[PDB]
Amino acid sequence: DIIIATKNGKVRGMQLTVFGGTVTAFLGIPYAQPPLGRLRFKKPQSLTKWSDIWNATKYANSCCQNIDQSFPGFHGSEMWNPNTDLSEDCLYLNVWIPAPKPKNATVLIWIYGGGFQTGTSSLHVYDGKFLARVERVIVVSMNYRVGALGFLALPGNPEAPGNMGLFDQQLALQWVQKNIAAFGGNPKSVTLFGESAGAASVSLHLLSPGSHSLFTRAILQSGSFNAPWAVTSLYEARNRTLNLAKLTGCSRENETEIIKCLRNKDPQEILLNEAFVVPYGTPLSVNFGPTVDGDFLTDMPDILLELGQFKKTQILVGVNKDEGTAFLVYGAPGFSKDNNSIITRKEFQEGLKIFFPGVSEFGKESILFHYTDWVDDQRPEQYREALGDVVGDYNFICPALEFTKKFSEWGNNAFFYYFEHRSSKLPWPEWMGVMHGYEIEFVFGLPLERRDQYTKAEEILSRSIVKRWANFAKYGNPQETQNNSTSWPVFKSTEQKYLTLNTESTRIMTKLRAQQCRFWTSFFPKV
């Protein structure tokens, strides 16, 4: 029986055997009042507190969300769908501690992605028991609100202020500050880590003054807030809230009466209509995301970043080799996860339409131009590959590299990686390569489980990554110091060194995607 006294009550955990050792898991501890009834759309409220023992022995409810049903029965898509009941009653977190109870362990706090529309902390690829066992860190993860229920904005109005899901995450950070020493953690050594929208969230906490004192450093996997999908403009946010109203029969005259009406809808009706609040979506549509609310976010974040207004600390940032490929099969014509997706020039042009819906003809031709000067054989896969690169470079890689340059210009150490290993168990086809999301299971140490049908070389890669992330969280320096490893140099504007992560040889390289990012970063924004 392991019981820990927290500020709000007693919690009971469960013991787990991992690699001949023990980890104690506390799954589903509440960290805020359930955001129901009058509380829907509002900032999370602090927990009232319980007498008696809260059993933290199973994953809690995942937040209300639309689900991926493009490939029923297929593991590659369905591994990302929630594996616990959906409910508005979803503001819970999880804690994995080493056994025996550590004395003053560093804390790793995971923030999942899902485009701010989906996701949950109970997914198998986010299981923190391996990190606790192997590195003796404490790992914490929280569910936070998504879609309209997390990000509906009527800016300035506390009935629906925007950014509720970000405040959900922030309230979980406070929970760690107030309670983690009781689990043997050191609230003075907290590193946030997150992937995609989770990484964009970590980047916004670096910018939010209310987050400054709730963490020590940060890790950003495939995302950052200056990614084109990551921040909804004030204008878009109001169009979308008003469209949503219109669709659910809630258009009113008094804004506060819009929200009161929206609070009477059942969750399904809000969810069903989320997809249509936008005139034309792309596969990366973020219908309801972060906004400049005047509260979590005090100014346009591009301006904070440019002018050096953010927490000064170390960062670790990276991307995967084929970020853009996952998205091509959710709409681009000629693509299929069940064939080699050889597409023609014309199909390419149509795919740009699908990914760049509000862009002038000239804007689109300029992309075609940058990406189709072939070298040079007339390889049939030319167009298929160019479309993946386009989608990945614009949406993930160039914004990651740009955030890292700008962050590092104000004096702090930064480290940048390029992940190029394709999982031997990947259920998606070969042409899709080193996909978006498929470093996560390396970071969490799944391939350390020998029973799991990953190769020996994958075991070793995961062990080295887990060590580098852990050393980064504890010491600010993502080195593996014992096994004659390649030193990971700081990323500086000017040299722009990065480290490649793969099974064969680890390399120091310079100026990732230099020609492509010059296009996305200095020209495309004018278009």
Added chain:
Amino acid sequence: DIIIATKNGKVRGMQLTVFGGTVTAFLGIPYAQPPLGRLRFKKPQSLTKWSDIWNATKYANSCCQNIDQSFPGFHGSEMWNPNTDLSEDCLYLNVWIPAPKPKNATVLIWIYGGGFQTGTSSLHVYDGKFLARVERVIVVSMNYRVGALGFLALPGNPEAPGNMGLFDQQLALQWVQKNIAAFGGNPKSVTLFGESAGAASVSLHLLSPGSHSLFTRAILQSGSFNAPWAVTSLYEARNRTLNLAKLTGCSRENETEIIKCLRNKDPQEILLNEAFVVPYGTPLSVNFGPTVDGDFLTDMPDILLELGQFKKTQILVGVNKDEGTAFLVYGAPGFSKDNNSIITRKEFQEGLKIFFPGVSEFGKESILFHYTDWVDDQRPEQYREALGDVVGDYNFICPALEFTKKFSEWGNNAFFYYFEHRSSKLPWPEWMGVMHGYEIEFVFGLPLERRDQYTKAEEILSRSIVKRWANFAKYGNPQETQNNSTSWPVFKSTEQKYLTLNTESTRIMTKLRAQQCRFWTSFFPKV
């Protein structure tokens, strides 16, 4: 109804519609005991406090002052005359806040000019509603005492210690520190800004130890305390107080009995005699201004500046292209706002007499010499232009550039601008060019009001200036980061870069007025 509880009582504001939005204005909140009866000539005393609601719904009384009556019915002069009743009962301030109430907004505090003899915070060109609306800053402005009633000095004697108007401003700064969080402002992010005597005041607050903790940074428009008009010497101050006495029938034997007598005069009689306390005035006469009082100002300010004794923070400093022209029509012979003011050599010589009344013949010939080596056509406008430059370079531009070099030599970032746009609505004639005072309406965002008959290009210039001032106040760096703008480089001794502000093209230039300032700065002071 918007009511805010302050340390001294409740205040009610009014709502205003600005650009489809709302700003709440609190106009005329008192911030000190009325300086009447026994309190005339003394430091401002702290506010006793009220029960009930103070209605802050109209501009308060402007301080006692002489008025400009050189051009009755002419908007160019009369825009500067007070637009509320004059009264010794004038120590009030104004607050504009964005709607809805901000969370922790930066604060901009305006200090008006008027040679320390005139001015008021209720003028149309100082209206803070546009800054609040557009940039979501809070804007504060205060009336402070002017002329003998603000600056009469009998140094060392608390019945009339000097610098009362500066202490008035300082007491308004304290009011912001104590009360602004209640209006949603951040007392830890206060930038002072001021023009001409208002800018000279901002520069003296940088030097005053009692002001150190009442603000974060500073903006100086066309003025700084080392301008020749800006600080009255101890000797001049005593001559002037004694002349004033003599004129009002108050000469006594006991200094304290001089002041007691002066306290029995009605305000008009003090004002009527102010102009004559000086043997010969110039159009820029500052009969009663700042002094070294041993209190606000602990030593001669030239010495503090030289030896690095001032608040260390960032500054933004600038001047207009034709600072000196406004003054030529208040006395220089051959000048008129109603003709082209072509003057001869002889008239030039006479104008130097008018502007440089106590200067040796050699002193005057040396100016003539520096400014009349023509290049070269015998253009009729030669003498008219040289006189404007003379007046502007000596009184405004060279002291601004010298304060910026000296300030920046001790390590802090400084930014310097040269404003060269002439308002399309300027009621003064063409020959007077880009006049002193006529950047103010750009800084306050008047041309953002489309109804107002300014051009499209003026709208855009004002929007860019308002952004740069706002970014300076919030972040210390006067950049406009979103619209491919020219970066404003720091001003360093050695390179001396500055930014030009105009409608056509923004430029980085070096060493403004280099030859002229070498004359004013290193030679003229010996003369």
Added chain:
Amino acid sequence: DIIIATKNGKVRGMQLTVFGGTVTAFLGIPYAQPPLGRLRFKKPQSLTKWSDIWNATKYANSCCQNIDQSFPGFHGSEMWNPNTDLSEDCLYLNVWIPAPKPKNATVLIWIYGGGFQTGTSSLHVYDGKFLARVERVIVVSMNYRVGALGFLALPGNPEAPGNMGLFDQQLALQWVQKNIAAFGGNPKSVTLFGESAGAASVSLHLLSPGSHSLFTRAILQSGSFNAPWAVTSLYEARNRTLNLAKLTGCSRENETEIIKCLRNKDPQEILLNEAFVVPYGTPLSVNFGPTVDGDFLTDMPDILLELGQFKKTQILVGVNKDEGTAFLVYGAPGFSKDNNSIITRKEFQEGLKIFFPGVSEFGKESILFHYTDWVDDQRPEQYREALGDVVGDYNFICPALEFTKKFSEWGNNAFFYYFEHRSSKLPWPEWMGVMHGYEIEFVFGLPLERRDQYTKAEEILSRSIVKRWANFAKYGNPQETQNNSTSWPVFKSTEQKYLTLNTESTRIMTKLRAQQCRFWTSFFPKV
């Protein structure tokens, strides 16, 4: 009668005449509960406190330990054996203060070596009365637990957590912080100094967060924790504890029941079996030493050192010219303290077997190769000398120089010495040279006693060393500033300057043992 009131009670000291002066000695003051019965194998517990006067007038019990009986009646070995009764009741310390009582004296705290298996603070060569007399420092020394009784580890289990002897030392450091001002010492000026395992201990206190605030700087004589003998791996520690159990009839099923059984054994039975817990020992066997316990030591120390996680302060580090020789006569074939120990190639090879028991054949040939390329005469002493160097360079000199480079790379000043004087009274034979342990009596100032049959030149060397150590403790800079002495330069990576200590001439030299350490440091660890 000298009585001093401490936090736990009154202590009485005794007066001693030293060099025509007086020192007050407090010998045997307790500083923790006696670690007996249920307390055996546990962290030291805080002292309960006494009413009445504790007589601190004789050395206390030395801790339980095996004794050196290789040369009964021989002073060279027996000078190192305890000179007070052995007892588990041994947690006492000693204080020497100058007379009269100083006002705010620097404190020197000695930690003895003995491989963590042996040693005691009452040995004649550790007598602090000369340092107090000559330099007016206060000197403190503590007994701490050794062998299984100090270092038995079942990691994670507080019944036997590991590192008890290190916690013993740490608890004595706290005692100095709480009580030394009462003896006239300055708890803000504490330097630790230690030799061999004592120096390794000082190096681990630099790494232990709980030691950070208990001292100012550090001195390391012939030892540092990255020496191959100095830290037991987690794996070895468990093998050894389980072997010990097996040998004493204490194997159980419940680990806690192993320790309860071990607590019923008499000390002799634990000691008798210590030597056998290891399959094959070397003469430098550390059967029970420091471990990564998660408490004193939060990670593998090689990793802390590499990544800059340690107290930032100055260090003084050094070694003796023939560190390895003492060990050759405890097992290497052909060696004797009673003859010239000329050995053959074959005997060399056998000696490598004795010193490098778990090393591959290739590992051993590589040592033979590095150390036997003769220059060049076939001198008979070739093999005898190479074996001493091998043992000394691997175990002492190269780890000392490597700790100093790594420590200094993070910004702090470091000073490195090479001691090359052989005591004129050394009872060991000539071939053994400048032996391990035989700088101690110079540091403690024994040769300042003229009655003692050391030479005049030895008197002067000791006086200069004592001054340099004292200046290091007080001022962080080990200079002798009055007698035209050679300046001791800081040791920097890159130049690697060190100071030689000898009777003839003091020299600045570079890159000690450069070729040998490249072998031990960059190649041998792979083997």
